[PDB]
Amino acid sequence: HMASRDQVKASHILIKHQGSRRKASWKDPEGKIILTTTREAAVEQLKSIREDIVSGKANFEEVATRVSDCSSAKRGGDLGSFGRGQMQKPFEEATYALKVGDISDIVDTDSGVHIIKRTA
Template identity: 45%
Template sequence: MSGVSRWEPPVGTDVDKLKSYLATHHKTSKPSSDVPQIPKPKEQAGGASGVGESKIRAAHLLVKHRDSRRPSSRRQAQITRTKEDALEELRGHERRIRDENDPATLGSLAFEFSDCSSYSKSGDLGFFSRGMMQKEFEDAAFALAVGEMTGPVETASGVHLIQR
């Protein structure tokens, strides 16, 4: 098992009707109270990182681009943005998260904008160990101390912000 979430609609499904239903019945302007809320990241203070830990818990916000390994998401059937556009979008999210005057958190932005199915849990991936994620993602996540957030991390899936 790769740990990658993937769902394809059954053969014969009217994808436009499905998208319309999901947009009408499963989209809210803010996360519900049963969705984990992820606080703003701490400034990197040289705290204990995940190095040496067997499992860590992290959340992320993924922005896919047309060269991603699966260039589609709940928001867009065929993603056409360039990698540069995806990075620009992700950097905009990063600026908002790091802005003390902006109430946005990684969790709230992941819920609204992430191209990963973990959006429904505010980007929370739960606990994972080495070997379960793509190497670039794993290395960045395990290097963080609890509460820290990366800058953009590029993987075959797209570009991510990762927070422990």
């Protein structure tokens, strides 16, 4: 029930980096942590990922299934809709601030680093 629009629908992806636990709660060999994308580097890896996804109508879905939040890997497509629920200060303000085109300016939060995309 509502008179105008409010809730925010949207899609997104997730890269791998240091984060705040291990790598991304994915199916990997616990073996031993190795040197790879890290906090800073993460933003750098996305800096070009957003750029690449920015220029060149490359793909995204299948990518959103592999390089995406474990659950998102299953839903590499998009979230769907969520006004003041789900997401939080960063992402939400991202889909609420952008609108297809810039593809969000590096979304590092929640799990690690993501990149939103609605219409396009």
